[PDB]
Design a binder for this molecule. Structure first.
Ligand SMILES: CCCCCCCCCCCCCC(=O)O[C@@H](CO)COC(=O)CCCCCCCC
Ligand SMILES: CCCCCCCCCO
Lengths: 219, 212, 103, 106
């Protein structure tokens, strides 16, 4: 079972604050430390701070300006990081990680994407991408899905509820007029489609939405 | 605070060759270094603890070495799934610190792109816009150019491109080119053409469709 | 049972307790101090043993006030426990020699 | 004697930007560094003690970091009243020594 559970995303207005959560399962010991790590897009890992839930003591990276306040709830086994008075420099992926008090991060959460912006949350529009009438296929066929007009990042795109992983790649989103757009591509043996169904699943955590789009031939 | 220097920042290797990432500490830290792997869009993943100790579930291909200030993470016979960023981390002194990371690149054989063009969906046309989508998939090397043509005339406005990082499945690259018009201008034209220029061919790979 | 042996055993178990609690509290007190080395529980237990025996190699030591207070507690506990073992041995020897003298 | 190197000697910053003065010791001195501010025609003024400990009456804007040989004095959102010379001083070994100072320009 997943050891550390974090929400997918948080949208925060400039100057506002947000409380990130990290729910822990698995073995819990009095020697456990919960660490928080910041990663800006295209940058390295930056240690923010640590907390020991059995005692409630928290330590922070002194090299950076303190934006975080760490707490923990032992009954729910959940660590919290309050980020306050955020600016665009605070937009990043924030991971929680568990250390058994012996120096290394044995397990990491999936990370919460925090976007600091004044724009409004917008769910994506998902459109199918099936080949045109005159396209010719080899032994393989390529299908896709267009995820357009969403904010903020991220979206998670799976194919056939995750059962289709080989032959998939999702392109990085491009940002225009406060809205993101990307496409996902899947390649399957041409003999197997459309007889075997191919569906894209698009999850937008910031809007709490998840939509399916079945790729059928332009018939 | 202990500085962890990871140089070079990019490592390029042929498939099946042994590779070695370097991590140098600003002071002697015994063996209190740990190595993590982060793939694209993924969270870090502990590979090695205390410089050389194996982690359950990590392929025997990975090993670690060194003590004091100089440490090495080694991969014997690299393969595509190793394409990732690699970070070292020290726990000898407070606070814990991270290295700046080294990216692993794999030099595979050249591969021509597989090009697919996609007309707009009827749902998007219902909404009032039209996006023509072109995939240039699984090519190598990463350098490639895309050109759009409408009714045989080159088109620049409304084109947005996006490139993947190197694929951890086959060491290739992929790119999408999306030409977005309003439905009105899309209806005023007939043929839409996506052309890929790549090292693997002197002639471009061309994919077109007629709105008719 | 004889008081000196019971006290020796009690001091042994109390010293084990002090070693474990001192490792925990030393890590708790030293984390947050830049440059501190006494920050992981395994080597903290090693350090606590070093401190209780007075065999202080110098590989680890606290740098904070509260880490050093924990250290003082560990020092005194270890020294007094080993001295109590010495005292119990002396009492055993004294009784045996009294008996050997037929007194 | 411990040499305290403060380089660069002049720091130029726009108003409201974060700034960082550097102090490097010729040998490892733990956290036994202290930071002072001296304005024009004024006496030195303790800003930070033991590398990172706050001083009563000093704006929360000031902070300090580092241990061993490399130390940093940071000002988040600089303002005009910060224009001054900044000195580091070590107390790890006798005798106490001073850095050569860094001037803050806005
Ligand atoms: C003229 C009489 C001088 C005789 C001794 C002077 C008394 C000084 C008080 C000592 C503690 C307060 C220092 C302080 O402000 O704490 C920090 C100092 O910056 C760090 O704490 C420390 O360095 C650790 C404290 C030592 C713990 C071991 C003591 C055993 C009882
Ligand atoms: C005597 C032991 C006291 C416990 C130490 C608590 C550590 C808190 C330091 O901030």
């Amino acid at each position: 079972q997943v050891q550390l559970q974090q929400p997918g995303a948080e949208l925060v207005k400039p100057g506002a604050s947000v409380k990130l959560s990290c729910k822990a399962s698995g073995y819990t010991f009095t020697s456990d430390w919960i660490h928080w790590v910041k990663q800006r897009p295209g940058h390295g890992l930056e240690w923010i701070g640590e907390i020991i839930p059995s005692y409630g003591r928290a330590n922070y990276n002194e090299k950076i300006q303190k934006k975080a306040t760490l707490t923990a709830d032992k009954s729910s086994s959940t660590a919290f990081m309050q980020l306050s008075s955020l600016t665009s420099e605070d937009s990043a992926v924030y991971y929680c990680a568990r250390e058994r008090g012996d120096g290394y991060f044995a397990v990491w959460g999936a990370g919460t994407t925090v976007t600091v912006s004044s724009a409004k949350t917008t769910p994506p529009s998902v459109y199918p991408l099936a080949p045109g009438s005159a396209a010719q296929t080899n032994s393989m066929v390529t299908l896709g899905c267009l995820v357009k007009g969403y904010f903020p990042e991220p979206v998670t795109v799976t194919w056939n509820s995750g059962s289709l992983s080989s032959g998939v790649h999702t392109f990085p989103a491009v940002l225009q007029s406060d809205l993101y757009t990307l496409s996902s591509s899947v390649t399957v043996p041409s003999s197997s489609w459309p007889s075997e169904t191919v569906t894209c699943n698009v999850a937008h955590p910031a809007s709490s939405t998840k939509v399916d789009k079945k790729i059928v031939p332009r018939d | 605070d202990i500085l962890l220097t990871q140089s070079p920042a990019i490592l390029s290797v042929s498939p099946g060759e042994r590779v070695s990432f370097s991590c140098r500490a600003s002071q002697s830290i015994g063996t209190d270094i740990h190595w993590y792997q982060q793939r694209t869009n993924g969270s870090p993943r502990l590979l090695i603890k205390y410089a050389s100790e194996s982690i359950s579930g990590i392929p025997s291909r990975f090993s670690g070495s060194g003590s004091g200030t100089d440490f090495t993470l080694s991969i014997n016979s690299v393969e595509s799934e190793d394409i990732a960023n690699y970070y070292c981390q020290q726990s000898n002194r407070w606070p814990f610190t991270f290295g700046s990371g080294t990216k692993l690149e794999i030099k595979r054989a050249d591969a021509a792109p597989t090009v697919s063009i996609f007309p707009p969906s009827s749902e998007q046309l219902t909404s009032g816009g039209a996006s023509v989508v072109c995939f240039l998939n699984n090519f190598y090397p990463k350098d490639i150019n895309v050109k759009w043509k409408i009714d045989g005339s080159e088109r620049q406005n409304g084109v947005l491109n996006s490139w993947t990082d190197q694929d951890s499945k086959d060491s290739t690259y992929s790119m999408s080119s999306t030409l977005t018009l309003t439905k009105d201008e899309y209806e005023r034209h007939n043929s839409y053409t996506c052309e890929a220029t790549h090292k693997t061919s002197t002639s471009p790979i061309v994919k077109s469709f007629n709105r008719n | 049972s004889a008081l000196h042996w019971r006290a020796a055993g009690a001091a042994t178990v109390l010293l084990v307790i002090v070693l474990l609690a001192g490792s925990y509290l030393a890590v708790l007190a030293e984390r947050g101090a830049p440059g501190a080395q006494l920050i992981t529980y395994p080597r903290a237990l090693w350090w606590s043993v070093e401190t209780a025996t007075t065999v202080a190699y110098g590989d680890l030591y606290p740098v904070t006030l509260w880490g050093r207070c924990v250290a003082v507690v560990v020092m005194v506990a270890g020294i007094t426990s080993f001295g109590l073992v010495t005292a119990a041995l002396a009492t055993w020897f004294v009784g045996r020699e009294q008996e050997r003298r037929g007194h």
